[PDB]
Amino acid sequence: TLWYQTNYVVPPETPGEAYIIAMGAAQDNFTLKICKDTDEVTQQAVLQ
Amino acid sequence: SDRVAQLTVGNSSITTQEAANIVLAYGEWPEYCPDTDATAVDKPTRPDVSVNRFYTLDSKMWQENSTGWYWKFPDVLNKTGVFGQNAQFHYLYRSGFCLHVQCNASKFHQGALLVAVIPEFVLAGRGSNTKPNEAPHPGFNTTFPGTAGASFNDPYVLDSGVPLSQSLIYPHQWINLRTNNCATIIVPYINAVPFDSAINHSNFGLIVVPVSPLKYSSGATTAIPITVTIAPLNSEFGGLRQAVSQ
Amino acid sequence: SDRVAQLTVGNSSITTQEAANIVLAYGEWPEYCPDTDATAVDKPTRPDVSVNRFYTLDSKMWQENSTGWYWKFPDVLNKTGVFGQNAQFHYLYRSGFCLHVQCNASKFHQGALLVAVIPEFVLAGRGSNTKPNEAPHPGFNTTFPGTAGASFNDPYVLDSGVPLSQSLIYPHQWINLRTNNCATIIVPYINAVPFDSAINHSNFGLIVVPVSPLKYSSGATTAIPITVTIAPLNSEFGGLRQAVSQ
Amino acid sequence: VETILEVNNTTDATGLNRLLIPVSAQNKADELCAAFMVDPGRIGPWQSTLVGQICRYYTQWSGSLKVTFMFTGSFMATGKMLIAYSPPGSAQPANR
Amino acid sequence: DPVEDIIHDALSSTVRTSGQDVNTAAGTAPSSHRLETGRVPALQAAETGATSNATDENMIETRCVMNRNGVLEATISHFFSRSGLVGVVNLTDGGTDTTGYAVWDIDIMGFVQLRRKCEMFTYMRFNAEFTFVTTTENGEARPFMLQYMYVPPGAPKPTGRDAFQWQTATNPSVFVKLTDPPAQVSVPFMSPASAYQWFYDGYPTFGQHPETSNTTYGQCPNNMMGTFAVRVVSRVASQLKLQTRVYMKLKHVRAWIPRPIRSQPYLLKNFPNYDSSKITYSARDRASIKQAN
Amino acid sequence: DPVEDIIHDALSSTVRTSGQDVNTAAGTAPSSHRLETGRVPALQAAETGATSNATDENMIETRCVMNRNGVLEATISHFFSRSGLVGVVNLTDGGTDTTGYAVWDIDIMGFVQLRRKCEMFTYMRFNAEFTFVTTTENGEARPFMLQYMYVPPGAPKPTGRDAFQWQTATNPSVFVKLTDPPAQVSVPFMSPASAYQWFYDGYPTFGQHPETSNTTYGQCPNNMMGTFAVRVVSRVASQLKLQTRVYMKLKHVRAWIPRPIRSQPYLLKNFPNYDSSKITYSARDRASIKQAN
Amino acid sequence: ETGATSNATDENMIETRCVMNRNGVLEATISHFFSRSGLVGVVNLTDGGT
């Protein structure tokens, strides 16, 4: 969870909204286990 | 190369990029109680991770006619955190704090802030009456405000009859909105006794005074807050007993 | 020369004069988590004095038609003691307990008591129905009774479908009112995972069963209580977070 | 290697703006900007990062995870933010 | 040096039963009568929880026996080496049942004879050797072909007979005929935990837990390890009533924390619920106390 | 060795400003002009809380001065070496006042001129040298004799002129005449604490504390150190109006944690209460900003 | 923004501990990631009267 610590303080003649890009990854000690069919494919028709 | 700063205590990890220069109160790091001076014959406890975290107090908004705020230590932490549940269960206590206060503002704003710790920061009844049995006195919630932190009534004398102009004898660091948005202090255990109670004797205070008033040309952020993040180091606890709220 | 016994952990110091022989579960002392097996990458905390005390549970009275009692660990300590306020603030946990149970009686009384720890002491719905959606199940307060400790309903099968006659495979020690008024067990951390939750997974149980019924000729003390004093050793805590009652 | 999360995976956020969390000034302090469940295999934002897609090909995962947060605001606008990871237990906290 | 109290315990925080390898039975040496006070092995104190060590030499006029009886077959490694039934599936592929597939979640608790063995040990760790015997309801074998896909937790489960999950580009599958000797597969220790747990004195989740019906009790997922599906390899249905038993062996077994043997009959799968109305007493009922049959 | 995490910090739990002895004033060496970039001692950052070290040599064309001004008189040891008034008693021994004795609890906060000095340092530790000047209200000395008993906390206080407490078999007492040079006594550091405290951010007791009138606030007892009584040595009353000032010196003083000097006037003894209606501004009021008198 | 991955290791953020890990990375390599066989095609050899 990300919280406003103090504020988004803006000078005059500047837009008073912005954006943050949240980028994620894995640290060096990332290790994985047995294989698994993913969930993001549900092919219905055979590709013709 | 000096403006960045990385302080990490416990599972926390604070960073400030614009503020610079840690000031250490009186040139002595916080250390444990030495063997040759302690009196509590029982073994004291050293959690060192659960309690030594950067607990963040509440945000106090800065207005153009603001007066000041203040807190008391370790009074601000007795209801929250494992340190709260550790101080309610122990008669004796010793720790050294790593104060850290933040006030973010734009490069078009102006203002300054006096941040200083005040050892044994007593307060003073605000009244001309000198009748001993009818003497004005500060209330409990006024002198022990808790996690929130009360405000001043006349900051020029610190609500104690001591002028603010001389208030830099104490360890301090200025927040000034042109060069630094943050400040920090590492203070040791300052007490004439090796240990003390935690819910009776506050070791020191903290003041955040708007010396120079926040002034901005209209058309910008009007609500400037102030947050203080606090972190005890080398804490101690002894004399276990039942709970005690106050 | 062997009947006396002095166990002192933390600021406590227990003594028993008539009971003899400490039994250590499975011949391994309680030890900290080794470096080569832990998974919690953050530093864990080692108070070692505040938590490692002899907390005393409530007295349970023994009647001539009594059935039994039982507790769960570390469930009995989550509302009380600094250990309670430490488990509510930490997701992970590891400790090893020093059980100790007391049942005082005169040299004219008779009776015996089976004291045993039960690893992973699940319970069982008491009903002949096998409908999966209408299956009888034990309630929460029945399986996690807390500091009080609930009673049995049929002790001969331990309320789990396991006969009490075989229940001595587990570490145990008999209280028998002719030779010892007390018993004690030192149990290590028994769990298939290096750490676990403290308010979800109970590591083990404890049973105190009146195998031989208390029988006394009329004209003596009729109210015999049973007290259990418990004491964690080499406790651990990690993953600090907010409070969680249950 | 980093890949962007679709942390703004809400209705009324369609198009490219799913990848961006808004940030505006708050007149009232102690405000919650955003939050998301860290579980990669679970549905949610991590379906858009690679490490959450590739984790689905396997059953179990271990090891520390890290997230960065690039700010796209103007040069003169400044602000402090608090990024808090909460271990499991209760739900996401109410106030900071 | 700054303070002794912190260096004392840390130095003394070091590690705090060297049993031998017993190849045969235990022999015995002779022993004569000994008429002396102070030394008694009979009058032990079982109340301390210890086993009495009243050895045979120390009670009677024994002899010299150099035993030779082998203890090889009593170890746990060869005690669980026997394979045993685990589950049955009912792949009722016919005209009425328009599914063509049958999914079965792995639960060895479903059948008693293998269950009661592993209940003796609370934490176990082993590798498995599954065996899928194959037949029809009549016991007849036929010229057909089957598919046996393991569907781990989180995988998409099959939906029908022509499902895309049977493409099995990642899921391990066994393609085997029905005129075949039984398929046999070794399986490793695929727990997310370090060791299996047949018991869990608590809940998987946090939060409230009701007291009227506690269906989430005693269900640790570290042993709960996904499903296992079967179909006949065909896009149109062949009318046959199939029922394949599945058997497993336990090898490289390592047990921990022995548990007593359950005497009461089983009533459910994941919960050890007995019945208060019919307590099955372990011992058979005798006539009187002094009438050994 | 069993686990590195416990031996690492314990080994690194060791102890974590070697100022010189300055006998004279600080001299100065010459300095020439230096016209170079990168090196500037003026443009400091007082915002870090540090003092700017813009020495005189580094700003102007200074000279060589080997100073000789002594700093001996500025140390704290000789700053508190002056004795000063502490209290007065009013032993009004006459016909109306049928007491013959006067008790006064030691409180140096009663008089401002000595108070404002010790307020500069929060924690002090010293030995005292009390001096009891003796006279009548007219300034006249007379041929009489006085007794000066120290009554520690817990002792029985005197009740009258013929009280048994004046037997003083344990309490230290000073028997002195009024035609005498002033009595003078050294007093040690008799705190129960390790150092005196002029301030206490809390309460002596636990429990509730009201918010309407907090009379127990800011009263540490470690400095509160009992009473001090006087009578004339006589069992019948002699009619004279006596008033003896008491003076003390501070020696072997060791201060700690310097505190600013109080500017507002004092109103009470044990509480630093000022008045909001009359804030005494420290600086005198000028005409305008650019009109230095 | 430089395109690099941040190397904010766990030791450098929090009060970590000592863990000598043992989790095997053998199964995550590409060699054993594609070692699984899988469906490719079907043919329809409809050998009949028509």
Ligand SMILES: CCCCCCCCCCCCC/C=C/[C@H](O)[C@H](N)CO
């Ligand atoms: C394509 C191969 C099919 C065979 C593979 C199926 C997965 C086998 C995994 C075995 C997991 C351990 C044994 C399971 C025991 C119980 O089901 C659970 N411990 C709890 O009920």
Ligand SMILES: CCCCCCCCCCCCC/C=C/[C@H](O)[C@H](N)CO
């Ligand atoms: C018979 C000898 C009479 C003189 C002895 C009287 C006791 C003197 C003890 C001095 C204690 C320290 C000085 C006292 C200062 C203030 O009174 C307290 N710190 C608080 O008000």
